[PDB]
Every structure is written in structure tokens, then in C-alpha cells.
Design an enzyme around this catalytic site. Structure first.
Site, PDB file in Angstrom:
ATOM      1  N   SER A   1     -30.271   7.078   8.149  1.00  0.00           N
ATOM      2  CA  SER A   1     -31.702   6.838   8.009  1.00  0.00           C
ATOM      3  C   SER A   1     -32.043   5.355   8.049  1.00  0.00           C
ATOM      4  O   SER A   1     -31.154   4.495   8.037  1.00  0.00           O
ATOM      5  CB  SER A   1     -32.221   7.446   6.702  1.00  0.00           C
ATOM      6  OG  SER A   1     -31.725   6.737   5.582  1.00  0.00           O
TER       7      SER A   1
ATOM      8  N   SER B   1     -33.284   3.294   5.828  1.00  0.00           N
ATOM      9  CA  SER B   1     -32.911   2.435   4.711  1.00  0.00           C
ATOM     10  C   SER B   1     -31.467   1.948   4.737  1.00  0.00           C
ATOM     11  O   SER B   1     -31.108   1.039   3.996  1.00  0.00           O
ATOM     12  CB  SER B   1     -33.199   3.143   3.386  1.00  0.00           C
ATOM     13  OG  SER B   1     -32.516   4.376   3.307  1.00  0.00           O
TER      14      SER B   1
ATOM     15  N   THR C   1     -35.164  11.318   5.224  1.00  0.00           N
ATOM     16  CA  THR C   1     -33.814  11.401   4.683  1.00  0.00           C
ATOM     17  C   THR C   1     -33.690  12.713   3.924  1.00  0.00           C
ATOM     18  O   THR C   1     -34.160  12.835   2.791  1.00  0.00           O
ATOM     19  CB  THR C   1     -33.492  10.240   3.705  1.00  0.00           C
ATOM     20  OG1 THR C   1     -33.644   8.985   4.373  1.00  0.00           O
ATOM     21  CG2 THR C   1     -32.065  10.361   3.205  1.00  0.00           C
TER      22      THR C   1
ATOM     23  N   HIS D   1      28.777  -9.978   9.777  1.00  0.00           N
ATOM     24  CA  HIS D   1      29.263 -11.287   9.344  1.00  0.00           C
ATOM     25  C   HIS D   1      29.061 -11.573   7.862  1.00  0.00           C
ATOM     26  O   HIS D   1      29.567 -12.568   7.347  1.00  0.00           O
ATOM     27  CB  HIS D   1      28.626 -12.415  10.161  1.00  0.00           C
ATOM     28  CG  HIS D   1      27.198 -12.694   9.809  1.00  0.00           C
ATOM     29  ND1 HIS D   1      26.142 -12.060  10.427  1.00  0.00           N
ATOM     30  CD2 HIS D   1      26.651 -13.535   8.900  1.00  0.00           C
ATOM     31  CE1 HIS D   1      25.006 -12.500   9.916  1.00  0.00           C
ATOM     32  NE2 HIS D   1      25.286 -13.395   8.986  1.00  0.00           N
TER      33      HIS D   1
ATOM     34  N   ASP E   1      26.950  -7.439  15.710  1.00  0.00           N
ATOM     35  CA  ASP E   1      26.967  -7.901  14.332  1.00  0.00           C
ATOM     36  C   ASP E   1      26.210  -6.968  13.385  1.00  0.00           C
ATOM     37  O   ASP E   1      25.176  -7.337  12.829  1.00  0.00           O
ATOM     38  CB  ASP E   1      26.377  -9.312  14.258  1.00  0.00           C
ATOM     39  CG  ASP E   1      26.484  -9.928  12.869  1.00  0.00           C
ATOM     40  OD1 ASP E   1      25.767 -10.916  12.606  1.00  0.00           O
ATOM     41  OD2 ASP E   1      27.288  -9.437  12.042  1.00  0.00           O
TER      42      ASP E   1
ATOM     43  N   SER F   1      19.749 -13.263   6.257  1.00  0.00           N
ATOM     44  CA  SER F   1      20.737 -12.705   7.171  1.00  0.00           C
ATOM     45  C   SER F   1      21.100 -11.253   6.836  1.00  0.00           C
ATOM     46  O   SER F   1      21.360 -10.920   5.680  1.00  0.00           O
ATOM     47  CB  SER F   1      21.988 -13.583   7.153  1.00  0.00           C
ATOM     48  OG  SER F   1      22.636 -13.552   8.404  1.00  0.00           O
TER      49      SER F   1
HETATM   50 CO   LIG Z   1     -33.131   6.680   3.726  1.00  0.00          CO
END
Ligand SMILES: [Co+2]
Ligand code: NA
Ligand code: NA
Ligand code: NA
Ligand code: NA
Ligand code: NA
Ligand code: NA
EC number: 3.4.21.47
Length: 480
Positions: free
Chosen positions: A11, A13, A86, A250, A300, A423
Site C-alpha cells: 500500500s 504508506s 489497505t 609436512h 602434501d 599450514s
Molecule cells: Co497502508
């Protein structure tokens, strides 16, 4: 079965900006719900004088989050006409119709109404909620079934009528069903009331993101590894299953004894004992000395099997691994997805956005980096020449094997670098709000803990799948 009804007031508003802002909240919510592996059926309605149904729960595609998000994205404020009125009562009647039936008792319903609470048409909306409760048989037998309905009301805008909004929302002890759209703390709490954390504990690459979370909550897969010797070693790893932690080879030597290796996870004070360390069979740090490679980091990677089995919680969870059924689901792809398809999705031929975790004085922090997997790859790999002891390497490609991914540098962005303590940690890609491990931090050109040639190399997990698949075959990870 869960149905979520998104009802947005369009709406006069509300206004264009706040309407768009409201859709954002909805888009983000759909995404977070999806990231938990939850698939509810969505209803999507905008309203003013009259309601406009964009998505109905009865539709097959209503449970397709991407499709619903698309619909929501296509909704334009100006699409909803007659903004002077609304009628919230009618909007809720539209929801009532979706619940109507012209195993219903097992479907949980969640209404999310975004409005300023200023209805000026139709009667009192509260009446429809009463009809919905009667329809779903709630508050009828003390089998109350209150768990089957939740009415959330998010107040939109600066000029909201708190009384009307409070009136429509659910009223459940220890819960909040009313939030101002801008109150990010409230909205955040709502999510955790809606979704059941328990149904997602088995999901890989999951993180509890709440504002109250600790470093352990934000990096649940993170494991700290200690080797007591000679100087002591400190490495990182990632939980990949209840019994296994993936890290770099490692970090250990054939001389290190099991009892000298301890693992720490979940922010627990105690350390964990390991059963054994499984080095990749092809790892041999002294295999290329003749070629002028003092330390050879090809392959590794290593898997640490723990003595005791871990239990998944909000501080201890597994990260997703490439080419597993877990990763397919995390990416929301069909069961027919292939490893190659996953590879194209996770490691495309370009600069790839990724991250790694680093411990900076008792605290864990994510460091964003870029994997040079496009035509910028060679330049990254060649900078390996400035690495300590690599000055007399005949063919640099002999040191930087097909097993490596490359990050660091100033292009496309100034990438941060890994520190010695990082690591073995995971190199991660963040997708679909989930975390997938694509690599293992291996070595770097420059110890910056900067130069444009300060690159970092990681073992590409896609390149060691046969080994991963073999050692984790009994871990219920469902490798493809
Ligand atoms: Co409204
Ligand atoms: Na779609
Ligand atoms: Na009752
Ligand atoms: Na739980
Ligand atoms: Na707790
Ligand atoms: Na699957
Ligand atoms: Na690849």
C-alpha cells in the site's frame, strides 16, 4: 511438511524503498532456510485494497527456492494497484484459501506478514487468524497443536502501529513473533525459532552464524594440531568426518610418535588422542632434491584418524569435500551431478573467490583470497622461483605440480598470505551459504608473518580424490 506464507503490504504508506527493503528480508530468509536443506512450500502474496497471489503452496514449483526467489525478485512495487486502500483481512483470507481443502494434520504453517499495521479497509484481521486456527484444529484439545501455526509480523517503516501488529502475531512463551524490519537482532532470532537445528547436524559445510556465536561456532570444522618434539609443531586441519581430520603431510615426520600428536576442536579445553596419521602414499619431501628441489611438497596431504569418534554439534562439524553426495546437496544440485560438474562449479577457469582461516592471537579470522585458475595461473606459479631454495630449479613446473592451486598477489586484489601456523588448514569456497573445502594449505614463496610475488600454494583436493575416496570409504561421505 512446512508451508511458509510471505505476505507483503504494498500500500501507499509503505513506499517503494521500504517495499524493496522488505523483499530483501524475504529473499535472505528463503536463502538461509534453503541452506539448511529444508524445503518448505511457499505462498507469496502482495496486498493493498486487494491481494495479488504470486505463488500458491499447491503449486509444484512452490517448493523450489530458486523459482520462488525469482518470482519475488520480479515483483515490482508498482505492480500492485489501488494503493490507497489497505485490507489486511483480505490478505490473510488469501492465506486461508491456501490452507483450505475443497496428512493435513502433519503440515506446520508459518505466516510472515510485513506491514505497518495500518489497515483501513475490511474488518479486523484477527478474525481470520481465528478461522485459521479452527481450520487447522489448534487450541481445540488439551493435543493443542500450537506447534502447527506461527504468525510472525514484521513492522515495516518508521510510522508503525505497534498495537495492531502485536495483536496478529503469535503469543508463545520464550519466543518473539514481532520484529521491526530494521531490528536485525530480532529478525535473526526469528530464524532460529523457525528452523530445527537438529535436522541439519549431519550436514557438511554448515555454520551457526548467530551474533552470539564464538570463533568455534563460525569455524566448526577447524582443528588445531600440536606436535611435541627439537622445536614443537603447530598446524591446522579440518574435520571431514566423525573420525578424520584432513591436514598437510609436512606437518609430520616418520619420527613423530602418535602420543606426541594432539588435536583440538570445538573450543574444548581438552586435547584429543589420535590413532594414526595416514600420509598420502606419494608424498616424499626428499624425492626431487636431484632436480634442485630441496623440499618437494607434491601430494602434501595427510589424514589423522582420531582415537575417539566425534559427535557433531554447533562447535564441531565436518566441512564438505569435493565430489561427495554431501557437496552435491550443499550446492543444491540434482543426484545425477558428476564430479566434473562439481569441479566446474567449484573451480572454474578464472580467478576464484575463496578463504582460509588464520589464528591471530587466540582468535580465528577468515582471510579472503583469490585462486588464480584462469589465464593468470602461470604468472602465479612462476613466482615460485623466488621461493627459498628454489632458485636453481630447472623446470619450475616440476616443483609446482598439477596438484597445486595458487593464491596470493596483488591481482585481481591484494591477497593476504597464510602464516606458518595456518599450514595444513583448509582453503575454502563459500557457495549456497555452505562451506566446501577445495584445498589444503601447503607452502608459500614468502614468509610475510608485501611482495607481489608472495604466493601461496595449496593441494587441490580434486587432484587427490582416489586417495581420499580410498581412506574415507567407510566414513559414510558418499563419494561419487
Ligand atoms: Co497502508
Ligand atoms: Na528458476
Ligand atoms: Na488447548
Ligand atoms: Na540441536
Ligand atoms: Na549451548
Ligand atoms: Na545426491
Ligand atoms: Na581440477
Amino acid at each position: 511438511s512446512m508451508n511458509i506464507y510471505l505476505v507483503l503490504d504494498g500500500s501507499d504508506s509503505i513506499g517503494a524503498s521500504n517495499f524493496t527493503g522488505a523483499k530483501k528480508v524475504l529473499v535472505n530468509l528463503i536463502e538461509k532456510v534453503a541452506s539448511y536443506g529444508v524445503k518448505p512450500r511457499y505462498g507469496l502474496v502482495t496486498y493493498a485494497t486487494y491481494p495479488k497471489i504470486w505463488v500458491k503452496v499447491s503449486e509444484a514449483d512452490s517448493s523450489n527456492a530458486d523459482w520462488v526467489t525469482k518470482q519475488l525478485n520480479e515483483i515490482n512495487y508498482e505492480d500492485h494497484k489501488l494503493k490507497s486502500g489497505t485490507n489486511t483481512k483480505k490478505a490473510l483470507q488469501a492465506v486461508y484459501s491456501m490452507m483450505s481443502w475443497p496428512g493435513w494434520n502433519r503440515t506446520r504453517h508459518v505466516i510472515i506478514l510485513m506491514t505497518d499495521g495500518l489497515h483501513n479497509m475490511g474488518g479486523d484481521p484477527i478474525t481470520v487468524i481465528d478461522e485459521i486456527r479452527d481450520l487447522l484444529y489448534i487450541g481445540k484439545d488439551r493435543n493443542p497443536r500450537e506447534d502447527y501455526l506461527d504468525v510472525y509480523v514484521f513492522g515495516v517503516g518508521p510510522l508503525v502501529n505497534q498495537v495492531n501488529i502485536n495483536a496478529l502475531a503469535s503469543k508463545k512463551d520464550n519466543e518473539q513473533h514481532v520484529c521491526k524490519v530494521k531490528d536485525m537482532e530480532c529478525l535473526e532470532d526469528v530464524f532460529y525459532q523457525m528452523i530445527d537445528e537438529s535436522q541439519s547436524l549431519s550436514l557438511c559445510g554448515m555454520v551457526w552464524e548467530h551474533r552470539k556465536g564464538t570463533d568455534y561456532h563460525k569455524q566448526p570444522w577447524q582443528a588445531k594440531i600440536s606436535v611435541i618434539r627439537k622445536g614443537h609443531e603447530s598446524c591446522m586441519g579440518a574435520v571431514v568426518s566423525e573420525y578424520f581430520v584432513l591436514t598437510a603431510a609436512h606437518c609430520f615426520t616418520v619420527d613423530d610418535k602418535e602420543h606426541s600428536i594432539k588435536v583440538s576442536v570445538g573450543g574444548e579445553k581438552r586435547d584429543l588422542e589420535i590413532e594414526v596419521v595416514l600420509f598420502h602414499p606419494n608424498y616424499n619431501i626428499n624425492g626431487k632434491k636431484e632436480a634442485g628441489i630441496p623440499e618437494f611438497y607434491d601430494y602434501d596431504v595427510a589424514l589423522i584418524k582420531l582415537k575417539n569418534k566425534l559427535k557433531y554439534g554447533q562447535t564441531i562439524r565436518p566441512i564438505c569435500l569435493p565430489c561427495t553426495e554431501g557437496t552435491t546437496r550443499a550446492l543444491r544440485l540434482p543426484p545425477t551431478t558428476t564430479c566434473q560438474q562439481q569441479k566446474e562449479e567449484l573451480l572454474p577457469a578464472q580467478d576464484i573467490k575463496a578463504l582460509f582461516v588464520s589464528e591471530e592471537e587466540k582468535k580465528l579470522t577468515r582471510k579472503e583470497v583469490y585462486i588464480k585458475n584462469g589465464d593468470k595461473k602461470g604468472s602465479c606459479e612462476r613466482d615460485a622461483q623466488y621461493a627459498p631454495g628454489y632458485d636453481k630449479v630447472k623446470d619450475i613446473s616440476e616443483v609446482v605440480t598439477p596438484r597445486f592451486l595458487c593464491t596470493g598477489g596483488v591481482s585481481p586484489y591484494a591477497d593476504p598470505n597464510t602464516c606458518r601456523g595456518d599450514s595444513g588448514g583448509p582453503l575454502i569456497v563459500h557457495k549456497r551459504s555452505r562451506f566446501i573445502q577445495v584445498g589444503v594449505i601447503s607452502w608459500g614463496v614468502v614468509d610475510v608473518c608485501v611482495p607481489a610475488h608472495a604466493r601461496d600454494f595449496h593441494i587441490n583436493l580434486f587432484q587427490v580424490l582416489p586417495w581420499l575416496k580410498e581412506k574415507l570409504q567407510d566414513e559414510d561421505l558418499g563419494f561419487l
